[PDB]
Point group: D2
Chain length 295, copies 4
Amino acid sequence: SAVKAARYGKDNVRVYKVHKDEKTGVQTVYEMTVCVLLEGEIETSYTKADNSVIVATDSIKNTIYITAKQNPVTPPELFGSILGTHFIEKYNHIHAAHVNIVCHRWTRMDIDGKPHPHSFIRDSEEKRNVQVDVVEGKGIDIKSSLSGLTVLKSTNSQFWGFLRDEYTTLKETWDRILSTDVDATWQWKNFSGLQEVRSHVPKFDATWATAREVTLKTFAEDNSASVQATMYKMAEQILARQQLIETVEYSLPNKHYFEIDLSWHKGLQNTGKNAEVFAPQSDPNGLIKCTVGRS
Amino acid sequence: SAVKAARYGKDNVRVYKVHKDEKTGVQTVYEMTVCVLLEGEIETSYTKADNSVIVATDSIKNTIYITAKQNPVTPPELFGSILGTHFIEKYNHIHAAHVNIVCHRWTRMDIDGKPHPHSFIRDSEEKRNVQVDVVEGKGIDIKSSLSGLTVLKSTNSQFWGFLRDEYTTLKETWDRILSTDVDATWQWKNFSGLQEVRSHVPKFDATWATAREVTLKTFAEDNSASVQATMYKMAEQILARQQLIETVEYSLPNKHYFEIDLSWHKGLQNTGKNAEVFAPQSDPNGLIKCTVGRS
Amino acid sequence: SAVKAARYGKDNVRVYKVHKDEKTGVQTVYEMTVCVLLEGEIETSYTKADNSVIVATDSIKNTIYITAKQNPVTPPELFGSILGTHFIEKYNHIHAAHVNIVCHRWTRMDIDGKPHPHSFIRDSEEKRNVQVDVVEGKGIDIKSSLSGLTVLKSTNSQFWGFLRDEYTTLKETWDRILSTDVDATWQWKNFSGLQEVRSHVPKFDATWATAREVTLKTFAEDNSASVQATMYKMAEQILARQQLIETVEYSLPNKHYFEIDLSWHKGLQNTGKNAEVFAPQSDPNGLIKCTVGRS
Amino acid sequence: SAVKAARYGKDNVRVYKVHKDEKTGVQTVYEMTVCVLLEGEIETSYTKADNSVIVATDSIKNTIYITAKQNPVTPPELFGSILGTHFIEKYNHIHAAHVNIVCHRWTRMDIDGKPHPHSFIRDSEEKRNVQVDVVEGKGIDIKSSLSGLTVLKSTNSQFWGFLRDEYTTLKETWDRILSTDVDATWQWKNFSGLQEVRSHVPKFDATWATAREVTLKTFAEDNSASVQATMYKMAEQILARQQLIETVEYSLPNKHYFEIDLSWHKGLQNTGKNAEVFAPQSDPNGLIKCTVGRS
Ligand code: NA
Ligand code: NA
Ligand code: NA
Ligand code: NA
């Protein structure tokens, strides 16, 4: 036997950081969950019990905290790039660092119409994420994403004209509910190293904002012919608005809301134009994916 | 043997309802999860295989949907009361209906600064709940609550002066993070029946709003001596603002954020006044509860 | 305002203990999650910022570990009783301790037909639990339970003869799937204190074994007329086999498996006697409860 | 813009099947969760609202059930291959089918020492899975796996000799707990189509059995130098025992059990050789991966 691939590290490293402005008294908090997995000349730790090549995962954990202490943790694309760069520069035999960061929301509270200097609310489980792959001699590959963005529209979704054969029972519709959990990823042009990532720092927050804005507005305003057609429109717009992105990926469940025929009860009309009460379905669900790039 | 207590019904009944204004085009959606459990003269279904006394749980499910079709589903205190009343009035041998409703958030989207007529976002997993116990000859007992309200403050929490003995290692502190998931319940005066519940309908949304407002403002503004002392202040205010509430209950975890001593690394100062990076602890957690009533 | 009720402590305290036999080399492990909440003369910690009455929850945590170090952690009824007794005896002003323990399974592995001395497998998420309420001047109240025991039988469940009215659509059946997650609780006679609990120690493991055995055999062998009738049979048997139990409680979901009519496709017969492929339903679910005591 | 990749279908399709032997009365059940995603000449459904190319996900669902009705659902490698083959053969413009199956355990109950003909228990959340990629003109690629196999050993794990620098605080140890959740995957040689998969049917159950056996015995018997070294031993053995497997992948968390120093309390000795009570850590966790192939 031989090792074909190997990576190892520390997962589920929860990190909080606070910034305190001594002048204004305004505090700002950041919270993330971090995974760092390393690759390199480590095969002998698997095949020959040679632990000498192991940077202990506990030390990886320590390094995450130390890096957060000595560097900005925002935008997460930058933090991840600093962190992955550290491992491949520090350790001659480590040749790649794979950094995944999940950012948790802590939105400043408004109390009596005014922003509070140190109190925050988790306004949803919606995450902002990065995957940063730092590979020695191959620069830094970053995928940014938003996930867990749960939406519903109560009309202006349609689904008709699909293939019909002996496996088909679904009725065509010109008016249905559409609800999804948005997972949207934008893949950046390869960066040559940390300096190039630093040169683009403002674009990271701005492009997350654009992606979120475009998703919400396109969902709200598209009289959707299908999930396929709506999500493509989202991806085209994001690509048009940030030339440093190479591709946009969406992964969208179709979380079904079924009509409930109640006509068996006193001839109650609850279908079609009279549909008011629905049964949300936990499973199954459609799952629609695409990756959109530049023509 | 003998049956000492028995209740049965349908749990996890997911319900959506839409309201469509034909004039304005504005749609409003509601989504809940409902449980109804019945009690009554049903012991023979357990002891003698006598299913004749069983209102099938599938029929309970049907009834939930039919009731949502024919009645407002908001405020949930009203919907629950209509639903529980139905079972005890319809079935001579059913003498209590226990209705639990979890309301899920669907907040209208703002697109380009303006409210969208039919598009919604789940802005958090925060729930608004009711427990409505409709008991024949004993009226309607309602407990209302908010849950899953996750908050953090980065300073203006303290904890000192607690008992110290041979089991104590915790250092006193005058400045710590405080984070919790708020579960807050307000218990209404008994209502004599559905008419009395109807007479108070506006108070239900208004008192949920007050409870939420009071929780957030008291959390943000109290330089907390302890979770015990802060939550008591919340409960006193809610009781002062709604005389139809008899008690207020809070159940608050203390979700710990631990300092990380990094002085072993290049003498890095990350404790006390220099504390910037923390390790959120998933477990264990403090759990603090109280029920506050009128003196 | 006034405090009507108050309890506080440490939740989600994960505990492992190992026993090592120096003679045989056989190690045995135990793993639990513990919650301890205290009551007593603590109201001033809520109303007057008086932390002097607070036994810190961090100290409660320490005490859990110290108690596990100095005492057996099995059976959990005993461990919980020792732990709760400690708090009410140690602290004059603490008058009740509420101890909840979830025991996690670590079953010894069989390797090549022989028990391994120190290797274990989690054979399911089935838990063994206790709730131990130690109340000064009122002894020790123990509820023992098993939970998360997931079972299915593919025939020899029926459901017919239930009430039929204008809300009913469910067809009567003489042959259906029955699947549930068993939550079964046995409530012990009040014990006067720790000595009495100690006097009964062997009965705790034996009665958990009986309850589990009775549940499984009654589920497997009863040609069930309803969940109500089957669970009652389980409770009667447990009461007959342990006179120190006062009541038995079951809480059983009916996790529905729906037939799928496929006759629209090439006249495929998949209902009734020809039913082979079913759709398990995640929600809704029946929920059936009863508490059985001595006649 | 242009579509670079696209796949769509139905996820979370829960399926039960029963086999009834009319002779013996012995029933056998199978339960799975299925995802099927299709690829092909479908880009116009995204770019031009052309739903004509869409095989509706609802029809995909129907097809899963119909396929389970007309074919064996075991071994899941076969079922997945039949299912994916169907889509690419039935639809000229569908060129790949990606089938993921999670198999849930339903182990026959033993009642009074004898197997019961129709009663089953979920003995753990351990899953048996397949990923079957059926690609027109490229055969059938199958990855088989077991996941959620949770184990612990209380000694005969070590970790010493790892790299030590200014980021390192972890003490070397010659005796620690090792606990993990095993995710193990074996990747089959490409099959040319369904006939070749059928030719190997017995090897699927046998190789899952070998992988499970090898995992458990190697975990129990290896005095582990590291997770890296133990998992490599597992993978080498599986490759030696099934020549139709090309690679074996393991992904193992190191679920930490921390010693608890209690010497601050009455000089209690609970570390090193005296370590009896430990604190299981929910997070962070080591994460160790490797892919082993043939030299
Ligand atoms: Na390097
Ligand atoms: Na009645
Ligand atoms: Na006391
Ligand atoms: Na094809």
